[PDB]
Amino acid sequence: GSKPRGKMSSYAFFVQTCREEHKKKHPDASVNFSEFSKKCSERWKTMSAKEKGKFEDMAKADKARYEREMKTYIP
Amino acid sequence: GSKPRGKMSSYAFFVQTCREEHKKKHPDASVNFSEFSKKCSERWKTMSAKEKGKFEDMAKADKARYEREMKTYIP
DNA sequence: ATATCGATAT
DNA sequence: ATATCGATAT
DNA sequence: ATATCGATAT
DNA sequence: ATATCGATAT
Ligand SMILES: [Mg+2]
């Protein structure tokens, strides 16, 4: 086998949603990576635990994917 | 210890020099990652075999770094 | 360490 | 797999 | 890309 | 066994 992909954190899932939002608001634009990161991170800082929760549940699931795949990985 | 950093390819070393060039030509601009990557890769394609050679020697050395460090890595 | 945002190369 | 280009969070 | 590994065909 | 191809993992 191959080395399993690293764990995707709750923030990593959240960044994907930021990019979705951004695409709808600016369907044309190239992403300014530096500004985009700063904006997502400022938005995440102000989110409540409720809004966060769905991203935490994605992360819990990927933590499970990762633990499962690592069982069989032989380096 | 920690996992050694992955091998830096001849191109990865080149992209650092592209950014240097770019900063001198456009000190004020934020990097458009998508466009930067496309321009770096066009430049790499047309760069002379002599110029490329120096990046290939950095990569050879980093390969040696990596092989040495991996001897003592325990996952 | 490794991942996201894009594109790319080794 | 892993790295670059920037900033960031887990 | 590339180094390495396995299956196949000889 | 060995030469080759081409998948696999990096
Ligand atoms: Mg990485």
Side-chain angles (χ1 to χ4, degrees):
Chain A
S2 53
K3 180 179 159 163
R5 309 266 304 112
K7 279 181 287 207
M8 230 185 287
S9 82
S10 50
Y11 186 72
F13 285 112
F14 173 69
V15 172
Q16 303 193 308
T17 293
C18 294
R19 178 43 179 149
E20 288 319 292
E21 302 320 296
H22 168 274
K23 268 172 115 160
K24 291 169 192 173
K25 274 145 211 166
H26 301 92
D28 285 0
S30 86
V31 180
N32 174 335
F33 273 54
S34 166
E35 179 187 293
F36 170 82
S37 175
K38 295 179 204 286
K39 292 178 170 177
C40 292
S41 70
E42 298 295 351
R43 185 65 203 94
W44 186 242
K45 265 194 211 87
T46 66
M47 269 157 66
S48 62
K50 190 193 198 288
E51 304 165 296
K52 276 192 175 186
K54 74 146 152 149
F55 301 110
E56 284 149 4
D57 304 329
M58 297 167 194
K60 290 309 193 55
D62 196 63
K63 190 185 219 293
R65 184 276 313 168
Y66 178 83
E67 272 145 12
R68 182 173 66 256
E69 296 182 340
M70 282 297 291
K71 276 190 237 294
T72 55
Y73 177 50
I74 292 155
Chain B
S2 51
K3 181 177 171 305
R5 307 257 305 106
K7 278 182 286 207
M8 233 176 295
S9 85
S10 52
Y11 185 73
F13 284 109
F14 171 66
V15 173
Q16 304 191 300
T17 68
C18 289
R19 177 44 178 150
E20 290 175 344
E21 298 170 299
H22 170 274
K23 183 98 180 93
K24 291 169 193 172
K25 273 146 211 165
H26 302 92
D28 55 315
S30 88
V31 182
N32 168 348
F33 273 54
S34 168
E35 192 56 34
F36 173 76
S37 178
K38 294 181 202 203
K39 292 177 170 176
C40 292
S41 68
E42 290 175 26
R43 182 66 206 101
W44 185 234
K45 263 194 286 287
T46 63
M47 195 184 51
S48 69
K50 191 187 220 213
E51 234 173 297
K52 230 121 179 183
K54 314 186 279 189
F55 298 110
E56 282 151 4
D57 297 330
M58 299 171 193
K60 272 206 308 298
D62 196 63
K63 187 185 220 293
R65 186 274 313 167
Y66 176 87
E67 270 144 9
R68 178 173 47 82
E69 297 182 342
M70 282 297 289
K71 271 162 194 140
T72 59
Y73 177 49
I74 292 154

